[PDB]
């Protein structure tokens, strides 16, 4: 008897006291104090104030500067759009519902907010996977006679959408489902209930393999071979100080990006391992939602790492922000 | 009968309904809805998350990099400390009281939070005034045989403290007073009550002249002469492209800083002019507090303009953040 159970939701709180209400009808102030909902709102406000400008500005400086519109940068524009999906589909909606103490948009806004918030995070995840593959192909040159072109970059973007739809769409059709999560103010895939009517268990395994394990392997393989290829070539030209500097900075950026991915990826693995073991105990609204809580920050630091730390993007943004000067 | 009146406070709400309570005892939810207090909390959280790192990091990179510890930069360290006073003395306290709906620290925490929050904003104001004077003396060279030294920079910092104490201390001694302001969650100088026991009217005139008009004149005079002196000298060396570039960027930075000062300064003048005229009508909790609401942002954008846009500070912060590399 961990929580209270009903049609289209699961409240992580026992109803032996009789105080539990529908997360669509009444505020869930037994899960957390009202000020904790306000701090959830403050967190959403922080993410919106930092997440929209950075991501929208990536799309804006690309319009003003011709040198940014290269095929290898298409996946970064896709990343910026994905974060805006997280910012408006997820963070903005949650800020509004948080101040009500419950998900005021009903069971259908759950499918809406859940889909778009899940889609944005999925598109961002695979955009990092695709960017890893694209850079691997360009540097390591695995294909004998291959040139990365505009059509190849469009496929990579379309591939993220297919993979993101592969995760976000089944819950609408009958494989898993969208229910309020955590403090019941935002919606997402139901990892919290073994709902046999929608075969939730099979969907969690599918998510764990296809959308969790595979992205880590692909990212680790591609960037590993890239750093190996770069260090191998620089070893053949140790007379060039620039090549040695270029090798150092490429390695350092790969380390930064891989550490960044792990910071978002490990909390899910740690919590899941703590649920694989310690399986018996009940779970408050912060058991599996703690990884998701901090993963929202990726909408801010991912553009900082991949776009703001890009050399050309930075100069173009400085020029754009400064009315064209400096 | 604009608001309700009592010992040590003035609530901007009529008590004909009988619902008004002491801003020290009970929440002021007739001034604003609970979610509006939460948004006040979210605003404080945004200012804290942006204001503490930027300002503390100014103090931190100065410790790691010897070239930053120049006398002309002392007033910028004073500015960073001033903003931390605003961040901890003001923003942090307000975030806590906001979630209670009233000033839970009583009439004495009013004198405490009011003093330190007023002191931080005053130190920052005069630090910009002193930096304007210091740069004017160094560039325009008004004194015939003068060299700006370490002792001269220490006087400039001490001068800001004397001026800031000249404003923040009288309310504790009997000239004006500290009362809850706006939504009664933060404390400050009483511009809202003609309290004849503390001669509030004379203090407002004193603040308007010494701490509002004079800082604008000094800043406008110093930077005007500086831009004039720089453009005059560059006109004598139009063969030097760097001098012309240096003149352009100095002028552009002065414009940025003066526009920034006006953005913080004009709303006070606009509201005061709208109170000088239209004197009869009553005022909600957002009449004179709207300038103060947006002036809190100076704790974030002032370090961005004066420190983050400094050439040496930027490279030192990048090196410090990047564990010493790049
Ligand atoms: C967590 O657990 C709590 C407690 O069990 C659940 O809350 C209860 O939900 C039931 C509905 O299933 C509520 O029962 C309904 O109450 C209505 C109002 O009752 C009050 O008002 C009447 C006056 O109209 C008073 O006389 C009465 O004493 C109550 O104070 C009634 O109108 C309903 O009556 C109808 O349904 C019943 C069958 O349930 C029929 O017998 C009637 O003839 C009539 O058709 C009904 O009694 C109950 O009041 C709720 N209790 C509390 C404390 O809120 C939550 O639903 C549960 N949470 C989740 C998520 O499931
Ligand atoms: C805005 O305006 C409101 C309304 O005028 C003010 O709120 C009132 O404040 C007064 C205090 O000045 C309150 O009066 C006191 O109420 C106490 C509680 O009364 C209730 O409970 C008793 C049972 O104990 C009931 O019988 C009664 O009907 C009430 O429902 C009393 O204990 C107090 O009595 C003492 O003082 C009076 C003199 O004031 C003596 O005659 C008594 O013998 C005894 O010594 C007193 O009556 C009043 O209740 C408040 N009203 C409301 C609605 O809150 C706010 O103070 C004002 N705001 C500001 C900032 O000034
Ligand atoms: C993009 C988003 O949609 C995706 C997700 O939210 N996921 C739910 C939790 C997840 C991973 C998938 O973690 C699990 C642990 C054990 C079993 C199933 C699990 O699914 C995700 C993928 C990678 C990262 Cl770095 C962060 C989030
Ligand atoms: C540092 C802070 O302490 C100072 C202040 O808060 N002030 C209260 C309002 C103030 C100015 C002084 O505006 C008035 C208008 C009419 C009469 C009296 C007035 O006082 C301040 C000075 C300059 C600026 Cl840019 C912003 C704030
Ligand atoms: C680093 C600073 C951490 C501060 C944590 C503050 C946690 C406050 O916690 C709150 O305290 C109130 C009493 O003060 C209680 O009434 C509330 O129920 C409780 O949630
Ligand atoms: C910019 C963000 C705006 C958010 C508006 C939040 C409005 C909350 O609305 C409040 O919800 C409560 C239930 O929790 C009700 O009891 C209150 O009557 C209602 O005012
Ligand atoms: C480094 C990889 C970046 C991908 C970040 C995606 C984070 C998405 O986080 C996800 O958000 C969904 C909707 O809010 C929730 O349903 C999921 O529980 C949560 O894991
Ligand atoms: C998929 C993630 C792969 C990350 C590969 C990081 C490999 C780091 O490798 C290290 O890089 C340093 C760079 O100066 C060198 O000094 C070290 O000798 C080298 O071992
Ligand atoms: C010590 C601080 C720990 C903070 C962890 C809080 C985790 C709360 O859980 C959160 O509940 C919200 C309700 O809608 C969801 O939107 C978030 O995705 C979820 O992470
Ligand atoms: C740009 C978007 C602006 C959104 C402003 C939302 C203002 C909401 O305002 C709130 O609406 C609620 C009903 O929805 C009422 O119950 C509350 O009393 C009211 O404060
Ligand atoms: C990190 C910020 C922590 C802020 C903690 C806020 C605690 C608010 O505490 C709440 O105040 C209400 C009065 O407004 C009381 O009615 C509630 O009983 C009390 O829980
Ligand atoms: C460009 C000049 C920067 C100075 C910014 C200082 C802003 C201070 O703002 C002041 O804060 C006080 C305490 O919060 C309040 O009492 C005052 O009403 C308010 O004007
Ligand atoms: C105290 C505030 C003084 C601000 C002085 C700003 C003077 C701007 O002056 C302008 O600067 C431009 C720079 O390229 C020149 O092109 C213009 O000819 C010149 O008039
Ligand atoms: C359209 C949005 C306008 C927002 C203006 C809100 C002004 C509220 O007024 C604010 O009240 C607070 C109560 O402690 C004080 O801390 C702030 O200094 C004061 O500016
Ligand atoms: C040139 O590239 C710079 C042009 C001038 C921009 C300076 C102002 C930037 C302000 C950014 C900080 C805003 C703080 C808001 C905090 C809520
Ligand atoms: C070198 O100068 C950079 C070193 C690596 C730093 C990259 C990570 C920076 C993260 C900043 C963004 C944090 C976002 C948090 C949002 C709440």
Resolution in A: 2.6
User: Cβ contacts (< 8 Å) between B325 and chain A: which residues?
Assistant: 252
Which of B301, B292, B261 lies closest to B126, judged by CA? Answer: B261
With an 8 Å Cβ cutoff, are A41 and B39 in contact? yes
- Whether ligand 11 lies within 6 angstroms of the CB of B26 is answered as no
User: Cβ contacts (< 8 Å) between B326 and chain A: which residues?
Assistant: 249, 252
List, in order, residues 6 or more apart from B313 with CB less than 8 Å away: B58, B61, B68, B307
Sign of CA dihedral A164, A165, A166, A171: positive
Q: Which atom of ligand 9 is nearest to the CA of A182?
A: 11
Gap from CA of A48 to ligand 12 centroid (Å) = 26
Please, are residues B124 and B200 in contact by the beta-carbon 8 Å criterion?
A: no
With an 8 Å Cβ cutoff, are A41 and B38 in contact? yes
List, in order, residues 6 or more apart from B226 with CB less than 8 Å away: B135, B136, B139, B140, B250, B254
Could you tell me the two tokens for B50? 């942006």
CA distance A286 to A292: 9
With an 8 Å Cβ cutoff, are A46 and B41 in contact? no
- Whether ligand 1 lies within 6 angstroms of the CB of A22 is answered as yes
DSSP annotation string for A7-18:
TTEEESS--TTS
The phi, psi pair for A308, rounded to 5°, reads -65, -35
Radius of gyration of the CA atoms of chain B, in A: 22
Please, are residues B87 and B48 in contact by the beta-carbon 8 Å criterion?
A: yes
The CA-based dihedral angle spanning residues B240, B244, B247, B249, taken in that order and rounded to the nearest 10 degrees: -120
| Ligand nearest to the CA of residue A16, numbered in listed order | 1
List, in order, residues 6 or more apart from B275 with CB less than 8 Å away: B283, B287, B288
- What residues of B are designated binding site for Zn(2+)? 201, 279
Which of A38, A222, A186 lies closest to B44, judged by CA? Answer: A38
Could you tell me the two tokens for B149? 């030294």
With an 8 Å Cβ cutoff, are B46 and A41 in contact? no
Question: Please, is A34 exposed, middle or buried when counting C-beta atoms within 10 Å of its C-beta (0-12, 13-18, 19+)?
Answer: middle
Which of B117, B115, B111, B56 lies closest to B91, judged by CA? Answer: B117
Q: List residues of A whose CB lies inside 8 A of any B CB.
A: 34-35, 37-39, 41-46, 49, 99, 249, 252, 325-326
User: Cβ contacts (< 8 Å) between A247 and chain B: which residues?
Assistant: none
* Nearest CB partner across the interface for A326, out of B42, B249, B325: B249
Gap from CA of A17 to ligand 1 centroid (Å) = 14
Alpha helical stretches, state H, chain B: 34-64, 74-84, 93-98, 106-140, 150-168, 170-173, 200-208, 214-235, 241-276, 289-295, 298-303, 311-321
Supply the residue whose CA is at minimum distance from atom 20 of ligand 6. B33
DSSP annotation string for B121-170:
HHHHHHHHHHHHHHHHHHHH--SSS----HHHHHHHHHHHHHHHHHHHSH
Please, are residues A84 and A55 in contact by the beta-carbon 8 Å criterion?
A: yes
Please, are residues A265 and A211 in contact by the beta-carbon 8 Å criterion?
A: no
CA distances from residue A310 to A58, A217, A321, B206, B224 in whole angstroms, order as listed: 11, 24, 16, 51, 37
The phi, psi pair for B43, rounded to 5°, reads -65, -40
The CA-based dihedral angle spanning residues A261, A262, A267, A270, taken in that order and rounded to the nearest 10 degrees: 150
Which of A73, A309, A270, A47 lies closest to B49, judged by CA? Answer: A47
The CA-based dihedral angle spanning residues A42, A48, A50, A53, taken in that order and rounded to the nearest 10 degrees: -160
* Nearest CB partner across the interface for A45, out of B42, B252, B325: B42
Supply the residue whose CA is at minimum distance from atom 17 of ligand 9. A293
CA distances from residue A64 to A72, A298, A303, B203 in whole angstroms, order as listed: 18, 26, 18, 51
Sign of CA dihedral A51, A53, A54, A57: positive
CA distance A110 to A107: 5
Supply the residue whose CA is at minimum distance from atom 1 of ligand 7. A261
Could you tell me the two tokens for B291? 């300038």
Q: Which domains does chain A have, with CATH numbers?
A: 1-326 (1.20.1070.10)
Q: Please give, one letter per residue, the 3-state secondary structure of A212-232.
A: HHHHHHHHHHHHHHHHHHHHH
Could you tell me the two tokens for B25? 């005892």
List, in order, residues 6 or more apart from A193 with CB less than 8 Å away: A5, A10, A179, A200
Question: Please, is A280 exposed, middle or buried when counting C-beta atoms within 10 Å of its C-beta (0-12, 13-18, 19+)?
Answer: exposed
């Amino acid at each position: 008897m961990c929580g209270t159970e009903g049609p289209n939701f699961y409240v992580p709180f026992s109803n032996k006291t009789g105080v539990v209400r529908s997360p669509f009808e009444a505020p869930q102030y037994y899960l957390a104090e009202p000020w904790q909902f306000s701090m959830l709102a403050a967190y959403m406000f922080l993410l919106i104030m930092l997440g929209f400008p950075i991501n929208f500005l990536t799309l804006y400086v690309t319009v003003q500067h011709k040198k940014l519109r290269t095929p290898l940068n298409y996946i970064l524009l896709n990343l910026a759009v994905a974060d805006l999906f997280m910012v408006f589909g997820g963070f903005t909606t949650t800020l509004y519902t948080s101040l009500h103490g419950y998900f005021v948009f009903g069971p259908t806004g759950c499918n809406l907010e859940g889909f778009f918030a899940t889609l944005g995070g999925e598109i961002a995840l695979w955009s990092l996977v695709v960017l890893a593959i694209e850079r691997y192909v360009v540097v390591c040159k695995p294909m004998s006679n291959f040139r990365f072109g505009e059509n190849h970059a469009i496929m990579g973007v379309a591939f993220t959408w297919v993979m993101a739809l592969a995760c976000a769409a089944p819950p609408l059709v009958g494989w898993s489902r969208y229910i309020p999560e955590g403090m019941q103010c935002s919606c997402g895939i139901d990892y919290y209930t073994p709902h046999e009517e929608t075969n939730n268990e099979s969907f969690v395994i599918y998510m764990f393999v296809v959308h969790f394990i595979i992205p880590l392997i692909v990212i680790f393989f591609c960037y590993g071979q890239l750093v190996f290829t770069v260090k191998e070539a620089a070893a053949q030209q140790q007379e060039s100080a620039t090549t040695q500097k270029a090798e150092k900075e490429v390695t350092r950026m790969v380390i930064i990006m891989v550490i960044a991915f792990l910071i978002c990826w490990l909390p899910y693995a740690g919590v899941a391992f703590y649920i694989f073991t310690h399986q018996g105990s009940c779970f408050g609204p912060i058991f599996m939602t703690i990884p998701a809580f901090f993963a929202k920050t990726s909408a801010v630091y991912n553009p900082v790492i991949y776009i703001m730390m890009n050399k050309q993007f930075r100069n173009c943004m400085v020029t754009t922000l400064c009315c064209g000067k400096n």
